[model samples]
Target chain A: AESADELLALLTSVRQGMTAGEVAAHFGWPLEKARNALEQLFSAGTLRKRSSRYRLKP
Target chain B: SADELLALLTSVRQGMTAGEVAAHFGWPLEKARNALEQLFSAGTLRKRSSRYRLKP
Candidate 1:
């Protein structure tokens, strides 16, 4: 089972921009987990970048 | 955070004086002083003592 998979999915669905730290705090995930998951999503093209900002793809 | 720093820099970039900022934002003089200290530490802006002009 996934830990913050649902929350990440929801955030992606809504196309909300949030930093890894912000998402981790919101979902109560450990910092390492949050960073790793964000990296994974970013590599998978599920996220977009904007001058040090992160957001879901349109 | 970088965003916080950027926002503070933006405030300074808008060319408001310390006293003017204090009056407009309804912040105490001491609070404005503290914010200026932080901004200086971040190397975002500079000002002469009690002056209004801002320098990058």
Candidate 2:
């Protein structure tokens, strides 16, 4: 699994939305890697965005 | 996967198959295919003939 897959797994662990920095910190990933993965998930419509955060789609 | 996939398509100036994107991004075929298919489902990309591309 790549960053995107790992990101989805991470998203499933938390119910609240997360900023990219928060995800990066939680996953020990680079900021850009976290941001890109989040964008990728959002682009795939697997995650929803709110303001500056993201959460798994219901 | 989806973000870099889109960037690859943009830079390559062509649509791509799942295998192609998988190879280029070092993603597993299933993951690559899944991402592309999800993008299609999300209306962010389209499939045409044998490849997928960003929607116009």
Candidate 3:
């Protein structure tokens, strides 16, 4: 419904997942937005933290 | 990484949350938490609420 939702879709399509930097670059979003959005999904357990990368859950 | 973290803490002379350390070093949150918790167990750091600081 918003930018965050769009970001989530972007995340869903990334098979290997992404780092905060990768998300920012791919989404044309600022680093803070990328990190915070990822953290939001992460907090909800929709994403898995894989070292430096954030991967979508199975 | 822990060495760098300790040095940073020493240089700043202030407490920091694991989140702060992670963002400053570009480390994963869990990685930073691991390092900080390691230092805490080693008696090198003290946890005051959510922040970690050198033991005095």
Candidate 4:
């Protein structure tokens, strides 16, 4: 859950949305976790994605 | 909703989560989840560990 928390923490800053590549660059991590977790949250209803950007799900 | 979602679950050898379904339809996650939850509540589907499977 450590990485998950950081992922959520970073999402807190989204005004419009964020992308997986942007998250990877921001976290200095591989694109793998960024996408893996993003899809997880996105599908779990924790987040929403549009045009490749993701934000909290309403 | 029924189009992609039904085909997805129908073809799957295992269950799929709302997120998985969302990925397929490029849909907002919660709406996908909500639709799926509606299915579960209606007894049209079954779930385990966040994954929904077609009911027998």
Candidate 5:
């Protein structure tokens, strides 16, 4: 992975909740890659995760 | 392998397909494919149908 900046760019662009695959699809990323990035964000309190779905905190 | 792959992409002055890259480096198809795929998923590269290109 290069950096979290691109991850933030894509995640912040979406306001609605989405699955890991949906997020990957939206940015042409692999599902695993998207999932990992989301997990990192969730762990960092930068995103909210509910039942494997993710969305911006606000 | 990943580091080498990134270095390869970084040095590419123009876009290239995974096949060409694999052939150039004598890498297995899967190796080249996976590397390019990883970069694409990482948002460090772009894909057009089947071709892969580095991001600006």
Candidate 6:
């Protein structure tokens, strides 16, 4: 259930504050999983979201 | 803070994933994130958000 490439791409997209749909397309991940993963990362403090922009915590 | 910040600066050069760096350096994810954010804000690292690549 863990794909490093997908995770990396997810991280990248969030850093730019891209939306879940945008991240899913960018990484070719399933829309549901992409959204789920983003939520997890956000909860993990790996990313932060402000309004519509998801910024990497770093 | 300068020394602490410098060590983190050096660590960022290794191209390790942020997760890997956090694990290897014994840093909490929040600390690692803070370091990366600081570097990004300082312009020491260029962030490619689409790829998650941090480069000089």
Candidate whose lDDT is highest:
3
In model 6, the Cα lDDT at residue A45 comes to: 65
lDDT, candidate 5, residue B7?
Answer: 65
Classified by CAPRI criteria, candidate 6 counts as incorrect
Task: Sort all candidates by lDDT, best to worst.
Answer: 3, 2, 4, 5, 6, 1
- Candidate 6 C-alpha lDDT tens digits along A1-58: 5578877766665445666676678778998887787777777767665422112323
lDDT of 5 by residue, A5-40 (tens): 766645554554556765677679998898887777
lDDT for position B43 in model 3? 76
**Per-candidate count of clashing residue pairs (backbone under 3 Å):** 0, 0, 0, 1, 0, 3
Per-residue alpha-carbon lDDT of candidate 6 for residues B4-56, written as tens digits (9 for 90 to 100): 54555465553444455467678897787677667668765555442221121
Clashing pairs in 6: A12-B49, A17-A54, A58-B37
lDDT pick, better of 1 and 3: 3
TM per prediction: 0.34, 0.40, 0.42, 0.41, 0.40, 0.38
Q: What is the lDDT of residue A50 in candidate 4?
A: 54
Report, to 2 decimal places, the DockQ of model 1.
0.03
lDDT of 1 by residue, B1-56 (tens): 33543454464444445455467567797776566566656655554322011111
Can you give the DockQ of every candidate in the order shown? Answer: 0.03, 0.02, 0.03, 0.03, 0.02, 0.03
State residue B7's C-alpha deviation in candidate 2, in Å: 0.9
| Model 4 lDDT per residue over A1-58, tens place | 7888877756553544666776777778798887787677777776666531112111
Per-residue error (Å), model 5, residue B54: 27
Clashes of 4: 1
Q: Which portions of model 4 show Cα errors greater than 4 Å? A: A1-58, B50-56
Candidate 4, residue B45: the lDDT equals 68
Question: Candidate 6 chain B — worst ten consecutive residues by lDDT sum?
Answer: B47-56
Local distance difference test, per candidate? 0.52, 0.63, 0.65, 0.62, 0.60, 0.57
TM-score of the A chain in model 5: 0.60
Q: What does candidate 2's lDDT look like per residue over B1-56, in tens digits?
A: 45666667665544677777778879898897788778777876766422111222
Pairs of residues at least 3 apart in sequence or in different chains that clash in candidate 2: none
Two-chain DockQ for model 3: 0.03
